[PDB]
Design a protein around this ligand. Structure first.
Ligand code: CL
Length: 542
């Protein structure tokens, strides 16, 4: 998928293109650059291409003239000024690779340097995005929401749209696409980003006019949506394996930690093929499916005296089964009690109707118990309170104060009101509501992300142009078409799931990719909101 593509562009385009069978090389990097390759290609493949050690430019290093030195950097004044510094000899010579275009000014001061003397290679790969999953990308700019929507960064807003616009143009170019660009009409941001992307995509089209040609690739579309178009989805407690695990449990750097009969630290990425299989399933179908795949593997390899002897051999491939069997139980531990009670209240507020289908009569009566409960943590009370404010489509100033007070979450008053910075409606409307679906589901997972409706419509060529205009109408006349989706201000894990549900529904006709500046859990979303009315010099510039 995306990790295979990105991995190939690196291994073959950067490491293999410089390899000298007799010689070996140091690979030096800045933070953004090494987050990219680390996310797709493994150390074993890196070694196989002729690299002795990997380093980080930001840290002090030892001189090794004997070894030539590759650099893979983002073309920022920090990385370049740090590179120039290495020889003005910490190395004998060096092969440079910028992940994007190097601006005149930075290339000029580099020509007046001593480094220049021993520069052996100098290219630019144009590759600025993390392949998080097979079908989900990230631009590695968690500072993006803050730069676009905080008033203390009003002057950097436009620059942040230009940066993101470029990153999204190099995504298409990487996938050999020249897709029709579309965006949600009302918000100023979505339109501005869409036109920026076209202008920076037309650059790559001009250099390679054969981009996106074909009866199938000509039908590819890139949709741009703002967070405020569906501020409900990022708040909800999802009961699918992934969305549920990252939300309820503490999972950092994508690593799950628990104890066995001793200190296991598993990485939930795409080498773990069991994770790839379960990540999108309701919590209620996980238990069985794990045991269903066990009964296959264990008995497939298998008087049972000899089977006992061969247990150490299976133990490793067999632990990987116990891994997710346990993670599922853990999801269920955290779900019992308050949470299962919250979900009920949330789904009623999101759908606007109880399980029977009967419309909710008194939405206030529904939350009041949860809010005045001292045993429910603040962030949980806040998700319910925000869902209530969104259902009501705004709430009176005085009613908001009485709820914040009676709910006992006064210190977070800030983040609640900060939802108006994204375009959402808190006090006293630009939100899209998912169409109804007459399809059976579990009582606690009746909500479908807005973006799924949008994806299905884009695929079937029935997406309203009034709401989703094109920037350019397609000229009158992998191989299949792609639908690329970019949610501004973070993408929820239900929306990530929606991409896989729609892609599988078309049976391979369409590959639906979705991504954003960063990936969201309900908690990280509230933290992003909290920041929008603060001056924080720690947060990175665009
Ligand atoms: Cl149009």
């Amino acid at each position: 998928g995306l990790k295979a593509v990105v991995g190939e562009k690196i291994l073959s385009g950067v490491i293999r293109s410089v390899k000298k069978d007799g010689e070996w090389k140091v690979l030096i990097m800045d933070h953004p650059s090494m987050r990219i390759l680390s996310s797709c290609c493994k150390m074993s493949d890196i070694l196989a291409e002729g690299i002795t050690i990997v380093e980080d430019i930001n840290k002090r290093r030892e001189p090794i003239p004997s070894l030539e030195a590759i650099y893979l950097l983002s073309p920022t004044e920090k990385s370049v000024q740090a590179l120039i510094k290495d020889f003005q000899f910490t190395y004998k010579a060096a092969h440079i690779f910028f992940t994007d275009t190097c601006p005149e000014p930075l290339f000029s001061e580099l020509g007046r340097s001593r480094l220049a003397k021993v520069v052996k290679t100098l290219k630019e790969i144009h590759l600025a995005f993390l392949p998080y999953e097979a079908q989900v990308f990230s631009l590695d700019a968690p500072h993006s929401t803050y730069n676009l929507y905080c008033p203390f960064r009003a002057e950097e807003r436009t620059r942040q749209l230009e940066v993101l616009a470029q990153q999204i143009a190099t995504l298409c170019a990487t996938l050999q696409e020249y897709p029709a660009i579309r965006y949600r009409k009302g918000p100023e941001d979505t339109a501005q980003l869409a036109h920026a992307v076209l202008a920076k995509l037309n650059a790559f089209k001009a250099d390679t006019p054969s981009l996106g040609e074909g009866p199938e690739k000509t039908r590819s579309q890139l949709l741009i949506m703002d967070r405020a178009a569906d501020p409900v989805s990022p708040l909800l407690h999802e009961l699918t394996f992934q969305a549920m695990a990252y939300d309820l449990l503490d999972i950092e750097q994508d690593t799950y930690r628990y104890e066995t009969t001793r200190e296991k630290a598993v990485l939930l990425d795409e080498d773990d093929d069991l994770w790839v299989e379960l990540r999108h399933m309701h919590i209620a179908d996980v238990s069985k499916k794990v045991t269903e795949l066990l009964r296959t593997f264990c008995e497939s390899k298998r008087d049972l005296s000899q089977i006992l002897k061969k247990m150490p051999q299976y133990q490793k491939e067999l632990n990987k089964y116990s891994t997710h069997l346990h993670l599922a139980d853990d999801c269920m531990k955290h779900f019992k009690g308050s949470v299962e009670k919250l979900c009920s209240v949330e789904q009623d507020l999101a759908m606007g109707s109880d399980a029977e289908g009967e419309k909710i009569k008194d939405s206030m009566k529904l939350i009041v118990p949860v809010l005045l409960d001292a045993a429910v943590p603040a962030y949980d009370k806040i998700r319910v309170l925000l869902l209530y404010i969104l259902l009501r489509n705004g709430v009176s100033e005085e009613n908001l104060a009485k709820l914040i007070q009676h709910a006992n979450v006064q210190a977070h008053s800030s983040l609640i009101r900060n939802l108006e910075q994204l375009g959402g409606t808190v006090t006293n409307s630009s939100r899209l509501e998912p169409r109804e679906r007459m399809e059976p589901t579990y009582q606690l997972s009746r909500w479908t992300p807005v973006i799924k409706d949008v994806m299905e419509d884009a695929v079937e060529d029935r997406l309203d142009r009034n709401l989703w205009p094109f920037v350019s109408d397609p000229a009158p006349t992998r191989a299949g078409p792609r639908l690329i989706v970019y949610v501004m201000g973070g993408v929820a894990m239900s929306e990530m799931r929606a991409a896989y549900e729609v892609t599988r529904a078309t049976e391979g006709k369409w590959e639906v990719l979705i991504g954003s500046s960063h990936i969201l859990t309900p908690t990280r979303f509230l933290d992003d909101l909290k920041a929008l009315d603060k001056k924080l010099e720690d947060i990175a510039l665009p």
